[PDB]
Design a protein around this ligand. Sequence first.
Ligand SMILES: *[C@@H]1O[C@H](CO[C@@H]2O[C@@H](C)[C@@H](O)[C@@H](O)[C@@H]2O)[C@@H](O)[C@H](O)[C@H]1NC(C)=O
Ligand SMILES: *[C@@H]1O[C@H](CO)[C@@H](O)[C@H](O)[C@H]1NC(C)=O
Lengths: 531, 536
Amino acid sequence: EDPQLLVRVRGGQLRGIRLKAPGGPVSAFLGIPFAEPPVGSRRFMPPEPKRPWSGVLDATTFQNVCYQYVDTLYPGFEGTEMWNPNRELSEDCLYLNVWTPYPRPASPTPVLIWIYGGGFYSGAASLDVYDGRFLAQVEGAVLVSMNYRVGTFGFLALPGSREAPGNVGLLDQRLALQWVQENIAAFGGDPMSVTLFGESAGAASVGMHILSLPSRSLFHRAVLQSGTPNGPWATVSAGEARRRATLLARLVGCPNDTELIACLRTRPAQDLVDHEWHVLPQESIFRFSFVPVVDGDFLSDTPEALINTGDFQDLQVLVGVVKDEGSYFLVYGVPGFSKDNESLISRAQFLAGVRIGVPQASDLAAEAVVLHYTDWLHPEDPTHLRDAMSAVVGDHNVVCPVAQLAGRLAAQGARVYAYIFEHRASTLTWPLWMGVPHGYEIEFIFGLPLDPSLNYTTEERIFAQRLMKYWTNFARTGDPNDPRDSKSPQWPPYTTAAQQYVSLNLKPLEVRRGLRAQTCAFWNRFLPKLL
Amino acid sequence: EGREDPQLLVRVRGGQLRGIRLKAPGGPVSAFLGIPFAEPPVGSRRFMPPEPKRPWSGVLDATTFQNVCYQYVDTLYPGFEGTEMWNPNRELSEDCLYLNVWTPYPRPASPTPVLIWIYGGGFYSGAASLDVYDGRFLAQVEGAVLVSMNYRVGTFGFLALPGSREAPGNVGLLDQRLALQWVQENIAAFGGDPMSVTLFGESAGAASVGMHILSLPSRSLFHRAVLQSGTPNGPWATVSAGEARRRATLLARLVGCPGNDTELIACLRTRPAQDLVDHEWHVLPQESIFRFSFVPVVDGDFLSDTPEALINTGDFQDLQVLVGVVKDEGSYFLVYGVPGFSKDNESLISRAQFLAGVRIGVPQASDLAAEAVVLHYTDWLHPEDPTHLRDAMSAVVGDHNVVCPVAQLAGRLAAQGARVYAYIFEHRASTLTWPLWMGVPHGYEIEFIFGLPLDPSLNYTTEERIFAQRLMKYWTNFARTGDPNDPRDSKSPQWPPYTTAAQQYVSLNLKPLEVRRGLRAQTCAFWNRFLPKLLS
Ligand SMILES: *[C@@H]1O[C@H](CO[C@@H]2O[C@@H](C)[C@@H](O)[C@@H](O)[C@@H]2O)[C@@H](O)[C@H](O)[C@H]1NC(C)=O
Ligand SMILES: *[C@@H]1O[C@H](CO)[C@@H](O)[C@H](O)[C@H]1NC(C)=O
């Protein structure tokens, strides 16, 4: 019984496990319950704090993955399998994980809290790309990651109802943040220094905690990787949530709110997942059925309204995108695209793809998009058309919403740092045409290249170390730059005036200005006016 | 006769003419100036199509320029070279239908290709007698036979009551057509070849050339065409019959007339010419720039349909066309109407002034289309930079009115089978009197095409002189063969045809030809494809 692996938290005692990291051991406490299992009558309901337990709780293995749709697009393909559940599915899934250096930190260490992505319909804190041992061992960080309900279980809502109020998956996240405040000191973490970081829907989640008052006292800084609370897919109005929920109910034979929800609660979990995707209003990509809802509660107004009118002084934020945000979503629904060929498309296929990629666009807006993205020197060139299709999806869903958030936060007094991640992993299994896809900067931030057995190059290992440094320096001080390192160059804050951001790749930081400025003016200023 | 120069006496359909021997830097040239080609369109002939000139007896003196067609005179900058070089340099009169001919001296031995110049001036001004249109250099150096005619402008040439008998519209275009017929019948007497006639013109002149290309009866009067900074399609070169009627009747009211067409026109004909000129600008529907009151009207006659419809569905095989723009088409128009601009300061404007400028420069734009323009032209890295805003205002005006209409025309002509050559003129005359911020303004390539730099007394640089000669070569080679390239000289890079596929065009400046691709392709897609669809 190694005393370093024995911790007492408010609920009782835990036993962690010593894990081996390339440069030394780390302590891991996996599968710690932070809420009462949200099963039976608790389905769709806000999470309740976990009741205390007797004895020593075994926290040596990852707990179950929240019930969710499983990808079958490319069966057995590492590219899609690396994101699939790697533990049993269960509605009993509200657990969190803590990695700490071994022996545990002598003095209070800044805490990083990871919130995974997966379109609000999938994901798990147990995936290998979210392994916190490297950041714990190399940077001496205390890293926490929690499971939160996704799909219908975490976001199906009948606004105004008592039994399915919406946003419970965000409340799962909040409860875990509350747990860190109350317990992290026992692991040597500093509850006075908590940094949230997440990617895609995880980044959007982080943004929603920034925009929801009760969450604000639970953290101090934030990192939003390729996702934002504002934008076309991260939220739905109360009316559209209600619509989707009642339509899903009908598809599974159900049934007044109470009765509808009571009947939904009797349905096996897989039945809900089976009809999840049938409620979207149009054929599309980068759109998800059950996501956070503007309820007038967790979200007092639309993210747009809240970022425009919020005061963000005393908040530091790191935001960024990867070089090809859209490619990944194309094989998932646009005729002509595949991971197995060059995906050279026709102009006809391009016009078709735009309707799918910008599903809420009127015919006129769609033509505006086509005309803005067509390269008039080579209007028929398949290579340009394929790349332009990717750019349209990535700009509309991630890049422009990120530029928008970055600008409003800076204007509203926040300290902001922005980046574009441009390195494609040597180990990437998707075709070259997809470039640096959505989600592929994560393995570098978590430091996986430091694992010899993974076969990353020596340069990639040096690169990962650089990133871990930027992220942990940011967690420690709200500034990603090295406090004792001259000869850099420096990563300057992003401002509405100069709009500076940096490129993250194998070469030294390079400062650029204007994040897709002309194109985002099109998405952020003109298309809306084409109301 | 008997005692004068035997080499200056010529006979044309209407009678005998006596020209004058003019000195050109490299030798003498023959000039026949002020040849009448129509009956004076005065009195009951005002607003009416021109009638052929009745024969005269004796020898008509053709040694001096004739009157300039009655027109508005520019006062923006009194005594300023920049605006004065374009103002009438002979007496204003409604009796102004005369043309001029320059030919080598002695006259050419064998039939020489003819160049016919059609001046610009927004269809409300201009004259074939201006110094920048002097044909002596092209005549002397390239051995060209050059012809230029006066045509009615403003109300006299374009006021119309569509359908009426007394003001059918487009009579200024009919004045030009009559001069083209005069050339067919008479140019051989000067040594010119009626089988080889090339029309060239700038701004409204270029638009005019384009309308002759789109009008059947004019097609048999020429073989090749050059359109410099102007097109028949576009936002300012034509108005619908309804808009012409509206403007004509509003003008009639402003001068106290008259009801029915006959009476209204009969009353307008009693008005002093100056009163019509004094009110012509008062009929435009919005505060604007690059918009002219009385211009060609889509009458269903001279213009069977809109130039747009005609270029989209026309067959242009066997047509060779040279087309181009200068580097800063819009700058000239900003000092004539956009608050914040002046020829006397750097015209650094505010974002507010830019937004107001856009409404004036794109007068037909709805609020939404105007915002689309502002968003497209704003540099989002430096949205408040005054230098960028000033330059973007210029580009907005130039692209909307000249550059994109030219891109559109070049593309449809090529697709419809025409052989097209395209250029962008980028050299600013060392003698330019406009401020530097204006760059290479609309109209400032003309003095080079005509070879004025060859005149020692004008103070152009030695490089400008060689440059002028190159341009004259391109234009006359094109007139001679339908190809600007020198049949010999394989050395100099070649000027390739413009095609929808490659979209090639060349840069004309002091350096050797450089081929570029896509004439403002991205921006012109906005003006030519998107703005129209924003038709709702
Ligand atoms: C540039 O000039 C514009 C026109 O104003 C006139 O010309 C200038 C040079 C002065 O002489 C002025 O007194 C004249 O009325 C102005 O509207 C514009 O604001 C000026 N821009 C400057 C100098 O900032
Ligand atoms: C690429 O693969 C997909 C799926 O097999 C196919 O539909 C498409 O036609 C292929 N060809 C292309 C677009 O390059």
